[model samples]
Target chain A: MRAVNWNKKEDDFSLMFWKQNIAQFWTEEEIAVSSDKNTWVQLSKEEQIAYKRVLGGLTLLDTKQGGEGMPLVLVHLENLQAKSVLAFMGAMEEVHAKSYSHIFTTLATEEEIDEIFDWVDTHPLLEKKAGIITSYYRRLLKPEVTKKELYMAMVASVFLESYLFYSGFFYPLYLAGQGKLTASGEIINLIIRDESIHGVFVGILAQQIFAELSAEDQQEVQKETQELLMELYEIEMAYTEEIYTSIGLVEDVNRFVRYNANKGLMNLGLEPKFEEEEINPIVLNGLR
Target chain B: MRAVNWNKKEDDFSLMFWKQNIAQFWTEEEIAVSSDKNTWVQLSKEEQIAYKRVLGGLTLLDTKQGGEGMPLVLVHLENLQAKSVLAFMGAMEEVHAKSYSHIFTTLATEEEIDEIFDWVDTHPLLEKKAGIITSYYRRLLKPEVTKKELYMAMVASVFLESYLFYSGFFYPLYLAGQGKLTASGEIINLIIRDESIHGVFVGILAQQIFAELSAEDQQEVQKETQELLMELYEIEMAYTEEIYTSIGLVEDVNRFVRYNANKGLMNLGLEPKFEEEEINPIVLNGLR
Candidate 1:
């Protein structure tokens, strides 16, 4: 029967996380976004273009994660409690994607919105990221999911939610720091908080899975996760440089992305991948 | 870019439904079962045994549906809005299972709880139901989920949420109407409402998918849904006989399942599976 009991639960941690997730649920519409309208209009053409493009990149990843990532792993999970918690995290990924839309709706005109969406499809860096993440997701679609495939799925998840998105996250934080677009920044803050918790919860699962791996498989996952993390960091830096080339924020965004990549490793209960450079101070200022 | 917009939404219906879903979220722990404590002890031995077993069956389908069903279809959905809606429905299946545990915890001894969970396994009818639903979900996991396969997934969804659960739902409603176990009944009502919305939303998607099918395929869906609905009814009838035979409620439970099966089809815009009889007067009294 493989029955689940909430009372006297065997997987108390998953239940605890599920309760936290439900309690923390928020929607995109509730944030005060109407105020960002003026700040958006006041930006330079270059600033506006970069912001729109960054959001386009963020939306693509969020949409993919929401639609494919958790759902892929969810079907094979034997623990019903873990399945439930992961399900909440999966739905919240949709909410995170919609938060970008909220920013877009308040700022970008329909033509501009259409342009940004179009850019997401053809942009080389974004396309490559999608290709890699999609392949990981496809691994889960196998007739039977192996432990290695499951590890790869979580690796892809941490990469997308934790590492790759930070460069995109930087633009919102950067704009808000200059005392502009604070409302849009608030939504990003909410999303970052959501993703942080999401990383922690999944990392817990990843740790358990890692412990059960045979020696070769454990070595394989560790090596693979490290390799994927750095590979994404390199990819994200290129994308960051390409987007922020006009504004000279490229190096700063790169640093921000690197800082978060370390956070990503830690969330998976692994050591930081690099000597953490201090994240650009201005990004922190935006949180104020 | 595959961008999703919550503002000036193309799918007003799904967006509205999504917002309603977020607002209606509630936890199983939040409900007060303390009041149901007295109601618990007063039940006759047959009644106590029957209540626990009904919940066992409901939990099995819910765990399977939550763990496997929505996640299977999610990987293939093109529209992000539908993905979000289905994800919410998927998570609520866990809530439904937990809702059953809430009832068991409030009333039963640990030994009783363990026995009923074991009852969930090795039960011929429950195993058969799980088998049928899993096959439909597996069809969606194909490299490509055909239109017919998509139709089957939604059909499986309604079978579990809207139709199959009625036999289980009857127990809660029955106990409540006797002016006992009213608190426990409140949890079932919440689950019923959630499941109702789930069926309506999936039924809406099912109709759209059906409309895209060839006439032959559409007929196939109609025929299959009707056949599955009846097949489950007989299986549930047999299970009900086994559980409630001593109480002599088998015929009445059969009538209630048939009525809901008709309602389930109506939600999907199909005609009834059988000439519908009124739900049992006793079942109606239970609702009050």
Candidate 2:
């Protein structure tokens, strides 16, 4: 990455970036889970599932983003300014994940802990997932890569960062809104602050890509990726619905799936193929 | 959202709840984005574009997670312990998005910032995204929801956390690997650490959900979700290719997209529809 001069134009965006990054710093001590364990056990079965799923989802998102996403961003980017921001963002994500683990370990039995890892590693579907994502990494490691190929890889990076992790974020907040997971929600809010910064880093990078590429080159790249992009969106939607519905969550599956898909495309300034009105009439009806 | 006694051992999973809320602990000083501005201006156009796109993607994901995903989780959940964790997780995601804006302000021109938001908010394709994700949230928010519905929501949340953010994480690292954007990569690494922990948290919760649910309910939930999960995956695949390709990214778009989609599914123990061998062979071959 090229070294960026920090002395350039300083605005709220830059200053905020600096301030938030600085002000948002924390170690694990600030969080206290001791008092809540007892209170946590009093929730209804449905609520328990909600709580566990939110925690699980948050943890999973952080792990993948930290373990896979950060490393990839480090590889393709060339600016130190963004790189510097990502370094902190990466650490923050991990810390957030760990904090949750600490809570889990504190609350669950040893058998439970073992079961957790087992679920992560041995889940029939997840094992296949590992091989799929890992292959992307293996490809990036290639010694010979075309510039177009590199761009595609970066595009994939953007999709992951922008679209995939929000469901986890939403789950906890949903609970908190009902006064159930207030403490956990507070923590999530803190993490969200940091993640926003992280998102900007990627957004800025994506814009840079657009700005830097020649129109012709951009077109060529687009032509190459059209079908692939659609395929990805479809896959995400299908899997998302299947997973949620399988667990008996009949509420808002289509809405969440479509919204996330649209968000990903929108971030890239692309038009979504699916119609929001048709996909989520209930939500629209509510708004009306 | 029934309340139960913590001391009772009636197969209740609420023992993990907490009463006193933890303060938001992060201070911005922990991150150091002091880079040379001249260096940033001097980067190759391609490199710059790469950086911005990545940041944009991150921002979009964070926003969706914060705005839509968190609320949904909060509404569907009842277990205080799990809810606490979910709340924290949601807050952190917001932090992450805010962090991105911070980085953009620090690194890019004002004009660039406008373009970024404009691209995200005004894009026709992107506008529809909110509906899809919000639908899920709406369901979770329903005044009356079944335990099965809650479980399904959990599954969706897990998919979002684990699958969505991987590719975005890698772009910076990929740049770093080329000996560019080292600082951003470092910051991202920090964020990655936190995310890893988050993944562990989710993994644990998935197991808990499996363990706590009635066998019949579990099977029913699983069966219901299968198709939806697949659909979600397909959607993800489509969007991945579209955004990446549209941006003129040069890397193996298909390979990266497939890999990320499959990986995310597998992480949740779901079966992958695409074959690792056939989907994007050239990219994989290069990796070999």
Candidate 3:
């Protein structure tokens, strides 16, 4: 019922997050597609399909997160600080999606780009993952948000920002690790940093809402979110196996997925599920 | 249904539009707000209130367009190139909103800024205008949209991006007319350019959709749209009287509104609604 005050908020974290988020922002065009031009042209056909398809999937995920997902969450928020945090992330997601198109126009032809975007339509794995999150967003359009739905939306946010993207992200980073397509890798690095902060920012709000509920509610969220993440992981694993197994890098990519899932947990200020002790130092270097 | 192709579309407009939209992007921080610091403080109390309140209204509208409104429209898009057009508009709307915050933090006390943004919540005209747009966006979210609904959505989009904004836009352009707050005026110039292109682009879509319908539906649209624009005009007229009548600026402001309403119609390839062959030629310099 109260009006929002962007200037003063009780949450110091949100204020700091808002400040930091606005200060460091970049558009898709700011990233250099030309630098990746030569490397992209030289990549093997298998490498190219994997790269394009991953970009295609990432593009749609971002379009949803930025265009649809953030708006759904922002509508339910009463606090200006929280709204600001999500809006900033929302713009980044929009731009992140655009960065892929930048890569497409730079690296390949019109048909080359269209085929992969077409691929997302035929691939149920990406559609299914995206659909689960879209449902949470639609349910929130109603006047009331149950404690459970709010938790589900937040969990879905983490899922989009943290869990699902890394499998797609691994390809460019892998190529860059081998000293190819470095500029494309650089764009992934920027997008990951954007997602990392979003995970932390949205996760803080998620945990606060989770704690306000009863112990039974807490258990429900943990169980549901865990189950959701596992389901998403399995679906992604099939595609990862399909995309990378042929390239003989399935294990490395899944390790990256496990590593990012733990990072997702870390963003939620919860326990990590995997005990890999380390993830790809080599690809991580490309991210750096 | 077929998926969108961002790579190639029948029209060159969408492709060229995407290229142009992303090229000249700006963040609030990137603007030199400090230059306007002196101008802001030096304004009369009335001028200051007008500036801030206009900014407050513009800020909320941008929030709706960028955060809630565009996403709603984007969900139903059939082509990626078309989606890209609106996405660029959506993101620019977001940054345009943020640019208001940059002005507030730079030029006014936090308390002063908070009070105005809070006022936005209670302001009947702003709220009413925002609500009209929001309702259209929500209705269009269905899996299937009738021709009437699509027309309603596009008309609503025109009302927002093209018509409803100018009344609020006038104050900044006015201050700039006096050759003060030139930096803030410059920011407005950028936003106006963005909206100008968007109005044309979205207007094109609206007209095409309008033409696509049966002859009876077209008349229904024309009649209803006229009624809608008049209704919006009257609602905004109430606020203009309250805010500008006191200072004897109401007539000129209304003139500006009439002029822009005609512009909106022209965008839809319709005839003019008002015969006001002239607008605020003095203040119009800043908009240029």
Candidate 4:
């Protein structure tokens, strides 16, 4: 087997890229929230429920990802520069987590806040949910795992960075359009700005990995990984839909789900599975 | 032994305190150093030599401290909330490392930059220097280590945060004051602003530990560990002075030395050992 090239030029170039990244970075305070509290209060009961539930869901997702996402990056990163990038990505995500808490502390009532924490901690459905997320992490944790396992984990990580965060992004914006949860919308925008950069990073990383793979290894990875990720994505979409439905959210959960999934695929430079006309018409119409 | 209290109230209080910390935080760009450049460039050759040597020493101190500091915190931290504070501290110090690099990149010439990187990579002095810092970290790395050892490690951490950062902070300023390296000094001012907050954090944590310790433990920690720390401080001071002297920097390296040591002791609420008149009279006169 050929030894993996850990070139200084690559690391140096990445450092320069990172310096540019640092230069472009902005904090939550740079983004402004709409000051339309009256409109927020006027949100329909169902819309209000959807807003809080999705925010709660997004918060839960960020926390889960922070705890689990980092170790996988640590396990797979072959060079110092990639390791640094992964480390920064993990740190940046925690900042996103804090950004949510900052927004929540300002926007949500005490009772609602308590509910969000409780929901995250003790939700009964989380047990079934843990299997999908934990399985990837578990494989990484195993002492006997191979390079292939690490590659698969990276694929899972790519799925998360590229796909998982977008619905959470769009849903709050959708609520903002309805003049509900405007503060939460502003927070999501800041998060989206960060995530957009994060997505670009993951996209670049995925391309690098894919390009570096030999045809046989690439086939093995595609064969072993694709079905699992698609199934995982479907599972995530279902669970998220159920969570939204239970809270009496008015949005078409399926369309929202497809939009998020397709966005992930599109970011990876793949074609979207759904037609533009057939996608979340409400979100589409709102933009129109 | 009573089980350690891990109640939500204490955790909540710590979290709230950390949030205030995050709110108060400022980056390197917050301070201005516009008028210092000419003075910095006009400094005598010996002074220029002193500035670079001391700055190199400080950068090495921060890099090592930032790299190894958190694992010790992880080892001794019994409470989740305290762990969070340490985690934030670790993240903040990593930012400090980047801030140092930002300063170095902006101020130093290309050949000078290569020399600094070479010094970091191949200096035999670093290995000799590692013993005091490493032993402090090693005490925490072993889980079976005694409580006194843990407390000592914490003190060592406090020393690193409060005392170790100041010399580096002052070196740039000292040069800038003399019209030698004004851009670097501006960056150092930003670093000092960040370190001031970090120093306060260590001070508060030290106070908390002091208040919480059993009488016997406190006595043992002070008698055994305080001396070790003072010895370590002296070693650091000597090493710094030697580096400056070898480089043929200013004759009076004592000012930078005394000021940093005094600042460390004063910040920790300890009285200075050296009398005011016996300390760096020249630097004191310059300050006045």
Candidate 5:
């Protein structure tokens, strides 16, 4: 119920993060996904299915992030600037969700859009990945929710933004690597920058919250973080294989997914859970 | 648990409101409030106090709107587009809250900024006004909360964005009428536009929620809405007299306040509470 005062200091870090977030203000309307329509029709049927499904999955994840995840995180925070930042991040998350809709309208017919969303609903691995992250998010809504649970929820949120999304992100960037749908790829890149920034800010807050735990609780949280990471990683791999196998890029996408999962963990101040492995250089170039 | 789909039509109205809200995206950083520093110094001491206090009061209101009000309203909404719109509205509210800080940093020293905020806390009528609005917002968080209560909360929020803020809004527009601190006044105008957009959308939602109540309940809500409007109107009068009496502008400000209250009620799909009064033509000019 406290009124936020931007003039008052509530730790410089939150303020800095708030500034960084505001500085990158964008909207789907500003990005013309229309120009990618011709390129979309040129892709093989397998590539088209992979591309549309990838976006549909990203749309669901962003919806969960904006609609439930950020709002839940904001409910438990005491820092006003941090609260403000989370609210904006939630807005941007919705913007990201809408960005995909813009892509759909530009490239696909009504029937295809409907079919892609049905796939989003029934794709078992996709559902599992979202549900696992969302269960952690909803945990914060409970009356008896603990600080440690909030920390874990933040961990889950970082993974959603930074790790869970990259499986969907891989194909577009790969398409861009071959000079296809480059405008659409630029939109993905914008989303990537936003997610990375959001991940770092949320990670910092989670680390600070984690520092307040007792030694036994700290060990407990670390154990759970590792467990959750691996658990989500497994689903992500299966999800990747399901989406990318038809396009024959499953192995490279898995490598990219692992690379992002490591980055997501490292952002949480946890150790990288995977060895350094070379990924597809072309998609790497697309990312840059 | 519902992930939003912008491609799917919820209702035309909510989607239209969502589009209108996104079309007006703005930030305080883009507005240069520093150019008014010289004009700020030239104002009489009473004018300066009124200006600073006006902004301080506004900062508190926007803080509550962004931090608590919009988030709480968002939680109860069943429509995904409405929910996303509210989240974005909450972000813009914070941006409005921060805009005041930018103006303060441009015009006041650190101590004066601190003192203004202290006044925001200690001013009895200001405290009462915010308290009355915020109490309704917090009701939505209750476990046993009803649809009627959520409707009331939306009413309170509309009054906040549409009515309560205008008392603070009057002086800035008045000053602008006199060609003083117009850049600072421009910021006030931008905030007004955002609040107006917000009030309309919330009012639509409140009206729709109200439509669902039985006749007895609808009558009961209308009664409460009228009573609450009068109650806040009395507080706005005393608050105006205290702040504007020293500047010899209390009567004109009161007229402006009454005019806005009627507009607020109309936005809630209720009748105006007072007769039309001719307000200060100069402030009217300022608003345009």
Candidate 6:
């Protein structure tokens, strides 16, 4: 109804997140992948498909995050400062989405680019993954949805940022681990850093909301969220099997996905769903 | 329902604007107004009040733009690329709001800061200006609103970015013209450059929607928009008079406001409503 006065903050965390987001602001244009073209061509034929499809998959998720998830969450929230933080993250989600295009244009042919997107649309498990997450966004738009429903949408958002994204991120970092296409991998690193903050920040918001629930109601929500994570975990592993099987890296990628899945769970203030496992050290190196 | 693919743009202008906005991305933390503190203390008592109130007015408008206006407009917009641009602009609106706080914290006491915000809330003419603009934003949120109403909201937005904001921008630029508080004026200049692009871009969008209407309907919309401008112009003049009267600069500020109002109309592809008027050349220098 009135203008937000920054002199009076709605909450300290939203303000801190606002500052942190702005401090790390960047554009994909500033980072070039021109030099990566040579390294890209030198990779094995199967490696090429894995790389292209991995990024293609990531583009779809970022699109959902920026295009729908953030906007829905933004309108439902009340505080101006919190809305401000979510709006910036939404913009960054678009930035992250566009960043992949920069890499695609730099490395692929026009026909190949068309196929990459076609693959994104036709891939079964991928579409299912998007469907599940997007349904949560749509549910938030309904007039009768509750605070509990809002928390679940936040859960889906964290899963997208924290858990769903890692399967695609794995191959790129894996490539970077071998010192291949490091320039292109740099973009992924930037996105990973952005997502790290987004996941934690949204997780904090989710935790705050969850804390307001009754003890019995809290248990019900946690059980529901854990089951939802398991559902997504299975979908991701299946999707990974298709993308990584051809490259003979399925097991390594599974370990990497599970590793990030636990991180996602921890971010939501939940116990890890999987046993602690080692990542491919080279992928870990690429993460740095 | 599918994720946005930037490789295939929905429209070229949206893409260009998205890139332009990212290239110019900035945070308030990067700009320091420390040296401007000395100049602030040296200003005449009335000069200080005018300066504080003008900025407070600006903060209020930017808050509405970022917090409510952008979000409202963004939801109703269709294209992913356009939505992406609005999202970034929304974040910048918050940044612009916070930027004023940075200047206030640097120059004023905590008690003084409280009074400035209080002034924003209680000022009659200022509240009327905000009320007029905000009502347009609120109309966009209605589920049954027509496309013409959407066009009106866009028109209202352009006026805010292009016309209403200039009143606040005028005094700072006027001071900077005298080589006073030039550092703080630097922030105003940054905001002006940003507003310039936002107004034109949204105006382009308004024109696109207007072009879709029948000729008769287009004329009706244009007439409505022009009337809206005249209404805002009167409010702005009255508000400026109160802010500038004691300083003997009301006449000069009115001329400046009218000049910018014409610029706003032209951006919307309408003819000027007021006669040509010359501005004091000194304020022009501050713009650079």
Provide the TM-score for each candidate, comma-separated: 0.95, 0.45, 0.90, 0.73, 0.94, 0.91
Across residues A1-288, which tens digit of lDDT does each residue of candidate 2 receive? 111333333222544554566567764557766665655676665555545544554565565555444544443445434544544465456567666666665557666654554454444433343334434433543324445545655555555555555544555555455554456666767776666566555555655676577888788777755665565555555544544554554345545555655655665556775567443443332222
Model 1 DockQ, alpha carbons vs. true complex: 0.60
Give one digit per residue, the lDDT tens place, for model 6 in A1-288.
355667777776888898789878888878989999888889888999888889989988988887678877776776777877888998898898888988999888878887898888888888999999888877754434567878889999999999899999998898898898898889899999999999999998899889987888788888889888989988988988888899899889889888889988888998988889988899988988
TM-score of chain A of each: 0.95, 0.75, 0.95, 0.78, 0.97, 0.97
lDDT tens readout by residue for model 5, B1-288: 245667778877977878888788888777897778777778999999998888888888998888778987887788878988999999998888888988888888889998888888888888898899988877765434578888999999999988999999998898888888888899889889999999999999999999999998899888899889989989999999999999999888888888989888889988887889987888977787
DockQ of each: 0.60, 0.02, 0.30, 0.11, 0.46, 0.40
Rank list by TM-score: 1, 5, 6, 3, 4, 2
Candidate 3: list runs displaced more than 4 Å: A1-5, A14-24, A27-45, A105-109, A141-145, B1-5, B34-43, B105-107, B141-144
User: Comparing to the true complex, what docking class would candidate 1 get?
Assistant: medium
| Candidate 4 clash pair list | B39-B178, B39-B179, B39-B180, B40-B179, B40-B180, B41-B179, B41-B180
Over the stretch B22-75, how does candidate 6's per-residue lDDT look in tens digits? 777777877899989888889999999999999989988988887657777776
Whole-model Cα lDDT per candidate?
A: 0.81, 0.53, 0.78, 0.55, 0.86, 0.85
- Of models 1 and 5, which has the larger lDDT? 5
Local accuracy of candidate 3 as per-residue lDDT tens digits, A212-237: 88999989888888888888888878
TM-score (C-alpha, index-matched) for candidate 1: 0.95
- In candidate 2, what are the lDDT values of residues B1-288, reduced to their tens digit? 111112222234323222111333332245655462444566667657656765766666655554445444543445434544544455455556656655677677878875666565554433443344444544653346666766666566555565555556655555555545555555665555445444445545555666677989989877866765566555555555555555554345545545655654565566775667443443232222
Every model: Cα RMSD to truth: 2.0, 20.7, 3.0, 6.4, 2.2, 2.7
Interface RMSD of 3: 3.8
Tens-digit lDDT string for candidate 1 (B32-109): 888987877887988888888888888888888778877887667776788878887788788788778877877888
Residue-level error in angstroms, candidate 2, position A136: 4.0
Candidate 5 C-alpha error for residue B108, in Å: 1.2
lDDT of 4: 0.55
User: Could you tell which candidate, 2 or 4, scores higher by lDDT?
Assistant: 4
Error of 4 at A26 (Å): 4.5
Off by over 4 Å in 1: B7-12, B285-288
- For residue B165, give model 3's deviation from the true position in Å: 1.7
